[PDB]
Amino acid sequence: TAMKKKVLLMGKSGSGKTSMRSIIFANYIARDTRRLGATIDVEHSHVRFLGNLVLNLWDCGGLDTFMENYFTSQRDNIFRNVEVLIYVFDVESRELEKDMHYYQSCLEAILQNSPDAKIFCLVHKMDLVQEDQRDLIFKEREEDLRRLSRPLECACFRTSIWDETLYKAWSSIVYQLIPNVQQLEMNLRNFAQIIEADEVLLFERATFLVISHYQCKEQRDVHRFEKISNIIKQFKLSCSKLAASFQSMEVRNSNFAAFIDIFTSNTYVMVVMSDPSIPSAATLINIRNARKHFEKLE
Amino acid sequence: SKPRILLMGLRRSGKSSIQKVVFHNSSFVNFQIWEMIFRGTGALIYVIDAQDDYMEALTRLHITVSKAYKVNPDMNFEVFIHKVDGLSDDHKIETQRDIHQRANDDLADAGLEKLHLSFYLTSIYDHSIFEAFSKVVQKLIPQLPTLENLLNIFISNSGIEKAFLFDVVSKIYIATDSSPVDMQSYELCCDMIDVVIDVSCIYGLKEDGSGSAYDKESMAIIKLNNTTVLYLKEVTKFLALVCILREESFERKGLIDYNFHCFRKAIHEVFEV
Numbered sequence A: 001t002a003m004k005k006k007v008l009l010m011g012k013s014g015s016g017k018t019s020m021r022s023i024i025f026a027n028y029i030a031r032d033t034r035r036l037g038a039t040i041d042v043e044h045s046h047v048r049f050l051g052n053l054v055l056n057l058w059d060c061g062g063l064d065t066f067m068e069n070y071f072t073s074q075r076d077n078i079f080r081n082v083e084v085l086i087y088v089f090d091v092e093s094r095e096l097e098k099d100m101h102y103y104q105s106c107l108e109a110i111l112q113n114s115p116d117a118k119i120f121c122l123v124h125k126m127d128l129v130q131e132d133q134r135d136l137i138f139k140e141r142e143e144d145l146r147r148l149s150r151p152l153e154c155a156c157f158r159t160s161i162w163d164e165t166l167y168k169a170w171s172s173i174v175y176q177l178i179p180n181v182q183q184l185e186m187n188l189r190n191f192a193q194i195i196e197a198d199e200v201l202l203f204e205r206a207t208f209l210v211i212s213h214y215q216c217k218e219q220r221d222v223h224r225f226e227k228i229s230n231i232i233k234q235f236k237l238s239c240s241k242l243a244a245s246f247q248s249m250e251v252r253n254s255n256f257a258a259f260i261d262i263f264t265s266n267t268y269v270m271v272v273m274s275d276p277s278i279p280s281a282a283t284l285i286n287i288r289n290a291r292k293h294f295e296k297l298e
Numbered sequence B: 001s002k003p004r005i006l007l008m009g010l011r012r013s014g015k016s017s018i019q020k021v022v023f024h025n026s027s028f029v030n031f032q033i034w035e036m037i038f039r040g041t042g043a044l045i046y047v048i049d050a051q052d053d054y055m056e057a058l059t060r061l062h063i064t065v066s067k068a069y070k071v072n073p074d075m076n077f078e079v080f081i082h083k084v085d086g087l088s089d090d091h092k093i094e095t096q097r098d099i100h101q102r103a104n105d106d107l108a109d110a111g112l113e114k115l116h117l118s119f120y121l122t123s124i125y126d127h128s129i130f131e132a133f134s135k136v137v138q139k140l141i142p143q144l145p146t147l148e149n150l151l152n153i154f155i156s157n158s159g160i161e162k163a164f165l166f167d168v169v170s171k172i173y174i175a176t177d178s179s180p181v182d183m184q185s186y187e188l189c190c191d192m193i194d195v196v197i198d199v200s201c202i203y204g205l206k207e208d209g210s211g212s213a214y215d216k217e218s219m220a221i222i223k224l225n226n227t228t229v230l231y232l233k234e235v236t237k238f239l240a241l242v243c244i245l246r247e248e249s250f251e252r253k254g255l256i257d258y259n260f261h262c263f264r265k266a267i268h269e270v271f272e273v
């Protein structure tokens, strides 16, 4: 017994669906995505996430012919028992009015077969828009996406494979699928207060997606969860390509100490300390002692 | 004593893309894009677009280089055969041999065959551009044999396999111990500096707006599941030591740390810092 969740990944052909999945779940780098083939029909992928959750990912080829089957002969197969629809939009697309009809047909099949399904819209490839225009273009599309989403709420995100914004969107999606995710946020709150950290992030070991975080004093970079996921993920891939697997990191300067370490068999942790009268030894023995306790949960 | 580099090429050669990827006052190296300037300059890097036709570009190359040998005939001429990430090795090699041939063949007929042209296959989606820069900058450091002897005494006496002296902003290595350099170790060390600097930018900048990510106490230890350890220490405000050693040598961390301070004071005296 681990909760199996059906995620649909859908959008016009070439919008970046497989590209995203190959970066978050398959250890690709953005450059490598240029070699991916068009996806024929649906490509099923089973992601063991934390070992109480399996993500049944449905990467649905976006060719016109494929979509037309998804609305007709395969309607039941596609749109039944769906927890999450992630819908991808190419910001560079010429065919907006045709992109909308394909999106709205997915919403209509989702409203008939899985109404309590969670809709995410990804306004994707924002690296090809000029940076002064990005916030402008995303607000316009979000507003349109929420009107055209009829009785349903969508949550929109502006994504690129070339930065942290992809980690922001997929962190957000997976947070909504994790079982007793508030139970975990408390158990981490506990650890953080006892160990006396300024901040503690918990990460899924394979994806390096943030699943839990504790702070005290609101910090300046609200976008920092994604940036860390991205920075460390990239280093993990350099470690296996260039030497061997990453195991641990210690970073310091005169203002902070940061510890990154294996935690449960299914997670990494990052502890941040603003150096009081705490030895290194006390923090290390607390991190070890807290493994058996988080181990239980999974 | 900051080495002076100039970077030159046609519109769309890749220059400011190269300036961006490498540097984004605050480098060990003084770097600028483009008979006055060429008077006090160590190195001129001519960038050619290799995805494009180079015949136009080979011409400007011969003019700007014959121009500047006239002014200062000690200046290093470095040629970045660039954007090679767009080609197959068959195409990389043929261009290399072709640019090599004609660039050198063109220099015979000006009677300037005492003017050396080093070549580099570079790309911004690649480390080649770092390797390439690391080579260019190393030729402009007169005290390079002193830095290399100091790293050698440091790693010998400290059970360390490999040590690089880095410009933290650029990820250029100005010196390494005498062991052969595996370029994968160099890349991995560069990727460590990025991880240290981007985590230091986010945490540890000061309660207020800001301060500096890198400072006298900047330190990192990375442990890899094959018991390899990577160990970074601030030397100066520009320069960081990165060491590669095994867990087993790292048991003697006290001896490494005490000896590190001899090496660091020694580096300071070299640069009269």
Ligand SMILES: Nc1nc2c(ncn2[C@@H]2O[C@H](COP(=O)(O)OP(=O)(O)OP(=O)(O)O)[C@@H](O)[C@H]2O)c(=O)[nH]1
Pocket: A011, A012, A013, A014, A015, A016, A017, A018, A019, A020, A030, A032, A033, A034, A035, A036, A037, A038, A039, A040, A060, A061, A062, A063, A124, A125, A126, A127, A128, A159, A160, A161, A162
């Ligand atoms: N600039 C940019 N290019 C991207 C981005 N995401 C993907 N791409 C590129 O655009 C193309 C997208 O290809 P895929 O990811 O295979 O597209 P897909 O949506 O799975 O397509 P189908 O299988 O046909 O449905 C590839 O060249 C990617 O490298 C992005 O965020 N920015």
Ligand SMILES: Nc1nc2c(ncn2[C@@H]2O[C@H](COP(=O)(O)OP(=O)(O)O)[C@@H](O)[C@H]2O)c(=O)[nH]1
Pocket: B009, B010, B011, B012, B013, B014, B015, B016, B017, B018, B082, B083, B084, B085, B086, B122, B123, B124, B125
């Ligand atoms: N694929 C690839 N593109 C590059 C490389 N270097 C530069 N470019 C691209 O070439 C174009 C020209 O680069 P740019 O730096 O503006 O040329 P500049 O006039 O020399 O500054 C830009 O679109 C860059 O993305 C490279 O190494 N590989």
Ligand SMILES: [Mg+2]
Pocket: A017, A018, A019, A037, A038, A039, A059, A061
């Ligand atoms: Mg695909």
